[PDB]
Every structure is written in structure tokens, then in C-alpha cells.
Amino acid sequence: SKRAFELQKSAFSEEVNIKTAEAQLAYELQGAREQQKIRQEEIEIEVVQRKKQI
Amino acid sequence: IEMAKAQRDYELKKAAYDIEVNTRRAQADLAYQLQVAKTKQQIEEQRVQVQ
Amino acid sequence: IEMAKAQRDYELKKAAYDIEVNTRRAQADLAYQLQVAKTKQQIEEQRVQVQ
Numbered sequence: 001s002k003r004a005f006e007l008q009k010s011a012f013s014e015e016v017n018i019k020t021a022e023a024q025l026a027y028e029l030q031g032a033r034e035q036q037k038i039r040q041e042e043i044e045i046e047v048v049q050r051k052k053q054i
Numbered sequence: 055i056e057m058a059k060a061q062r063d064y065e066l067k068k069a070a071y072d073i074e075v076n077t078r079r080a081q082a083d084l085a086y087q088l089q090v091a092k093t094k095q096q097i098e099e100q101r102v103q104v105q
Numbered sequence: 106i107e108m109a110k111a112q113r114d115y116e117l118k119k120a121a122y123d124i125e126v127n128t129r130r131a132q133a134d135l136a137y138q139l140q141v142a143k144t145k146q147q148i149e150e151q152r153v154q155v156q
Contacts, residue, residue, distance in 0.1 A: 003122035008055055010129040012062045014136045019069040021140035025148055026073045030080035032151035038084055039155055041091035049098045 003126055005055060006126045007129050009058045010126070010133040012058045014133045016062055016065045016069070017133065017137040018140045019066050021137050022144055023069040023072045023076070025141065025144045027076040027080050028148050029144070029151060030077040031084070032148065032155060034081055034084040034088070035155050036151070038087050038091065041088060041095065045091060045094055045098055048095050049102050052099065052102050
């Protein structure tokens with residue numbers, strides 16, 4: 001009985017840990033995805049500036 | 055055994071919901087920087103037009 | 106003699122069950138690292154796309 005219980009508990013812990021591990025790093029994934037556009041505009045700043053430095 | 059059944063049934067959904075809330079919060083945090091850069095574009099466009 | 110008969114009958118099954126529980130626990134421990142690496146793949150894929 002102890003073996004059956006431990007096997008089932010470890011099996012459940014497998015996917016619960018998988019889902020958690022996705023959960024923490026979804027934040028970083030979306031943060032980088034947004035930083036793409038953030039830096040795009042932060043660098044378009046001086047593009048616009050140098051356009052009229054002409 | 056059913057204890058772990060319920061533990062899975064709760065934890066998996068909690069993590070799945072946390073994924074969505076974290077993604078939306080990450081977008082919301084950097085929306086401010088995105089807009090401030092987009093308007094700093096015009097700020098600089100005129101701050102150089104004075105030159 | 107029958108004492109040792111019963112001792113074998115108990116110990117062998119206990120060890121056989123321990124083999125399975127240890128294998129499953131070993132898989133469960135490293136599932137976390139496997140998934141965190143699999144998602145760090147995309148983390149880095151975008152952290153370099155910003156460049």
C-alpha cells in the first residue's frame with residue numbers, strides 16, 4: 001500500500017512541478033517579448049532625432 | 055490517494071491561472087515605458103526643431 | 106527456519122517495491138529541471154531577439 005501511494009504521489013508531483021516551472025518563467029518570456037517593442041521605440045528616439053539633425 | 059488527486063486538481067489549475075495573470079501583469083508593467091518612449095519621440099523631435 | 110522464510114518473503118518484496126518508488130521519485134525530481142530548461146529555451150530566444 002505504501003508503494004502504491006508513493007508511486008501515485010510522485011506521479012502527480014511530476015506534472016504539478018512541470019506546470020509550476022512553466023508558471024515562473026512565463027513572466028520572463030512575456031517581459032522579453034515586451035522589451036522587444038520597448039527597446040524598438042527607445043532606439044527610434046534617436047532615429048527621429050538624427051533624421052532632423054539633417 | 056484521493057488527497058493527492060485533489061491536490062493535483064487544485065495546484066494544476068492554480069498554476070495555469072498564474073501563467074495568464076503573470077503574462078498580463080508583465081504586459082501592463084511595460085506599457086508605461088512603451089508609451090513614454092513613443093511620446094519622447096515627439097519630445098525630441100521638437101527639442102531638436104528649436105535648434 | 107520459518108523465521109527466515111518470512112524474513113525473505115517480506116524483505117524481497119519491500120526491496121522490489123523500493124526499486125519502483127526510487128525510480129519514480131528520481132524522475133519526479135528532475136522533471137522540474139527538464140521543464141525549466143525547455144522554457145529557458147524560449148526565454149533566451151526572445152532575450153536575444155531584443156538584440
